[PDB]
Write a protein that binds this ligand. Sequence first.
Ligand SMILES: [Zn+2]
Length: 271
Amino acid sequence: IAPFTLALPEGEALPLVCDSPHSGTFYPADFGAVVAPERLRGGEDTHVDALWEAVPRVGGTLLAATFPRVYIDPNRMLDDIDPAQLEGPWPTPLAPGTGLIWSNVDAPIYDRKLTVAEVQRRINRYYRPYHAALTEAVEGAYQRFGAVWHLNLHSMPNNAYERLKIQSPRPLADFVLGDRDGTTCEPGLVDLVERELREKGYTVARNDPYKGQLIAQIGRPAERRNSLQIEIRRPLYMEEGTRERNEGFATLQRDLTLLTLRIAEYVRRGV
Ligand SMILES: [Zn+2]
């Protein structure tokens, strides 16, 4: 019933703070959707938190959502709501891009408009705790170390280009690294992650199709605060229909453990 898990290091801590906002699979009773949960499981970045289990084993902190992102999405801003999805007016200005509250799975989730009150309660019970935990980890790290490296962790469907409105002359990479075109993370870490993953045989794209807003807010490298969004092509570890770990899960998790150890070393040397 806890809105997040928070895996802390057993030994020496380092300022590597990692969050998996989309891996939650515990659906609230008060969802009130008209669509079968089997249809909603779509937008889950399933198992992404288990893929990165090494993080606390190497001194990092791993935060993960237990609620589904299709219920409320912690990687969106609180004003990323379309007025037309609400029954009634929102008390403050909205700036949709939408979203924070999913409205459909395909071009519908509900047979009605959500109340202001209902969305507010989602925000209080699930989003705010999750984000307070992320803040506490990021600011705690920075306060002790004078730097922080934040990884925002995801997976993506094979047709991510189709689902976004993009026609790419290139295939979708195995890993996409978003740092808002080179502005939210100091370059040496993006270079490290890219090189280590390509050496293990994975394809890596930067900022294509995912460039990273939370990431712009956390990642200000001139203040020694760094943020990188990392996206994993789902077929690499699960079966997109059943959502179930496949034969690639084990090997990918192993590769990410080894990558994480390398990042921990890079972080310790950067403090
Ligand atoms: Zn995601």
